[PDB]
């Protein structure tokens, strides 16, 4: 596991990996914001 | 420039040549009836009504001829097994010859009604153009149909003038052509009650006459006339196709499930008699009753008729067959010669063991011998290594009561295994397969083939209803559309 | 003899394909 100093920050690490698939959804959101101009 | 699939539309607007082509189809059907009867009579064996009835030999029109009253033949043999003293002109050969001569006469009439197509009868008296008054035609032909239905119900089948129809006992052991009294109560709607057939064909027939007198007197209303496209022959074709496929579904269902009109002495047993043990229960009930009278097992089983045992065989199940397993049931399995008897399997302890019967779904079924309390006590194992319920391990012996092997006991494991495998199919019979070179796979009885053929026709004619009716409703646009 | 029938049927199908490819009716424009 993580070194004992970083143990409390385990939830952040458990959440991090899904951000790259959030970026493409963000691109779609941005396109929708401009009415798919 | 008609495409090959539209050629027979040339007679759509020609009443005379429509009459001619319908006459030709009628002549072809009658000729087929006669020719099929002749072929069946030629290839039919009437010697043994038991263990070799019509439905074993693949006869298809013999069941219907026998059902409606024709039983004897000019060859001196009767389908019931007696001697033909005077078969008369209405033997099987008589019916075949009559349908054949009718086919020839219809051929000549078709030729005539084809040559002289331009008859003034088909001209509209006012406008002078060719036209058919379809409501009046339906009224006339419906009045005729109802008259014939009432006549058939009241005189035929009832035996007032006709011969009656085929009536049998519930177990299909003693059946014959008998007059039928109409059933006017609720039991007239019992599908297996014969008395419904006359009464219905009476009452319905009467209604038809009245219905005719309406659809012949009262002209259709304008809204209904244009709504139902009355006056177009293709609308009539669509409605008739619908009605005929409905009737095909009904007859297919009533033959697959069996009814008073499809007896098992003419078409064979249904699969639901094997599934529910209709004959097995009766056989065991008779055996138990005889035992309660004090008789031994051998006498009780010797008292069982061979035909009743023959019905209790999975080879006669109509649902044990193949699409391309063609021909008579005798062609797949040998010709039945005699009943071996009833096989009783007993372990070395003396506990009676019963062989699990093959369900209709299973082409192959493992052999299992089961205790009275539904506990598996023996089997023919697939893995002879470290077997648990082997025949040799349990010591199973088979004793035959009645039939050819009466009072004979076999204890060698090979014979016991063979007979258990045979008994999983029901009652055990001896078959002569050298005569017809039987391959050894079950065929389907005539009721199965009838149901399959008429069900496929029912589906195709549902598509016919759809197509010809769509053409009826959309006649204006079926020559093309003018955009929106 | 069954093999002969099967071979004949396959040869017939292939010949029909060949004729439909190289002896087709020309597609008439207009």
């Amino acid at each position: 596991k993580l070194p004992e100093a970083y143990a409390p920050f385990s939830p952040i690490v458990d959440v991090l990996p899904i951000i790259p698939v959030l970026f493409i959804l963000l691109a779609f959101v941005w396109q929708a914001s401009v009415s798919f101009r | 420039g008609l495409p090959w699939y539209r050629v027979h539309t040339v007679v759509i607007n020609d009443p005379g040549r429509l009459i001619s082509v319908h006459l030709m189809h009628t002549a072809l059907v009658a000729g087929w009836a006669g020719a099929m009867t002749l072929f069946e009579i030629a290839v039919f064996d009437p010697s043994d009504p038991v263990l070799n009835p019509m439905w074993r030999q693949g006869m298809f029109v013999l069941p219907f001829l026998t059902r409606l009253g024709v039983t004897q033949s000019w060859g001196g043999w009767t389908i019931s097994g007696e001697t033909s003293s005077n078969p008369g002109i209405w033997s099987y050969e008589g019916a075949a010859a009559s349908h054949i001569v009718l086919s020839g006469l219809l051929f000549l009439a078709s030729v005539w009604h084809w040559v002289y197509w331009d008859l003034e009868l088909f001209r509209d008296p006012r406008t002078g153009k060719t036209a058919l008054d379809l409501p009046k035609i339906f009224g006339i032909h419906l009045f005729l149909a109802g008259l014939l239905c009432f006549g058939f119900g009241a005189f035929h089948v009832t035996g007032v003038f006709g011969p009656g129809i085929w009536v049998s006992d519930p177990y299909g052991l003693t059946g014959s052509v008998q007059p039928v009294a109409p059933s006017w109560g609720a039991e007239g709607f019992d599908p297996y009650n014969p008395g419904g057939v006359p009464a219905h064909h009476i009452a319905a027939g009467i209604l038809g006459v009245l219905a005719g007198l309406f659809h012949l007197c009262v002209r259709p209303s304008i809204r209904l006339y244009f709504g139902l496209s009355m006056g177009s022959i293709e609308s009539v074709l669509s409605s008739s196709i619908a009605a005929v496929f409905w009737a095909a579904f009904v007859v297919a269902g009533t033959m697959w499930y069996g009814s008073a009109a499809t007896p098992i002495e003419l078409f064979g047993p249904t699969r639901y008699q094997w599934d529910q043990g209709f004959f097995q229960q009766e056989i065991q009930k008779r055996v138990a009753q005889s035992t309660s009278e004090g008789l031994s097992v051998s006498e009780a089983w010797a008292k069982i008729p061979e035909k009743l045992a023959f019905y209790d065989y999975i080879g006669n199940n109509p649902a044990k067959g193949g699409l391309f397993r063609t021909g008579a049931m005798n062609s797949g399995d040998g010709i039945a010669v005699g009943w071996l008897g009833h096989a009783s399997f007993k372990d070395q302890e003396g506990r009676e063991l019963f062989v699990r019967r093959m369900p209709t779904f299973f082409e192959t079924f493992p052999v299992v011998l089961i205790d009275k309390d539904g506990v598996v006590r023996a089997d023919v194992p697939f893995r002879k290594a470290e077997s648990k319920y082997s025949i040799e391990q349990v010591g199973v012996s088979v004793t035959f009561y009645g039939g050819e092997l009466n009072g004979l006991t076999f204890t060698d494991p090979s014979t016991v295994k063979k007979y258990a495998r045979k008994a999983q199919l029901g009652e055990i019979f001896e078959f002569d397969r050298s005569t017809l070179q039987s391959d050894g796979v079950f065929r389907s009885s005539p009721r199965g083939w009838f149901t399959f053929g008429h069900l496929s026709f029912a589906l195709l004619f549902f598509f016919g209803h759809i197509w010809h009716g769509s053409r009826t409703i959309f006649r204006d646009v079926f020559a093309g559309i003018d955009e929106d | 003899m069954e093999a002969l029938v099967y071979t004949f049927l396959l040869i017939g199908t292939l010949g029909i394909i060949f004729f439909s490819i190289f002896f087709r009716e020309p597609p008439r424009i207009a």
Partner: protein, 187 residues
Amino acid sequence: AYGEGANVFGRVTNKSGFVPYAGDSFALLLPSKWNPSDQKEVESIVLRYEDNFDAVNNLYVVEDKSDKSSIEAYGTPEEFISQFGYLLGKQAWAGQTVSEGGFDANRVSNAALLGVATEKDKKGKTYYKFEILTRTADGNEGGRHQLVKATVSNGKLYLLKVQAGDKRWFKGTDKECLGVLDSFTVV
């Protein structure tokens, strides 16, 4: 009950995987995933359960009267297990074969005694424990592990036999079989 209510945000009842069972004079734990079975290959079987997935994994308890006063009266545990040679099935095949590897001439099945011992109880009861591996010429599931636990009390011999395929045994059925064998307790 009809108005009992659901178990939303609730707690499980048990996740041990074993459920208790009380016999005529014996107590046992059976695997949860194993279903009760009806077949009795031996007429003296009084209990039988079988795995839901692989019916080769099963167990049965046999209770039959014994003339011997105690389980020790049978003799050595090996002699006792040699007495019950029919529990491993029977070779119905009777053909002369030598083309099978690892088997003696004319034999298609072989049982190897991996080990025998004697156990104790809270009341000092002695149990004969046996582990066998039965292989066949076809090598069905790479052999079968048989666990036998036998005792004699009140003039009756109780014998629990657990059978597991080697293929199943490798991938975690050993835990269930050993639990069944351990939980077998007679008065």
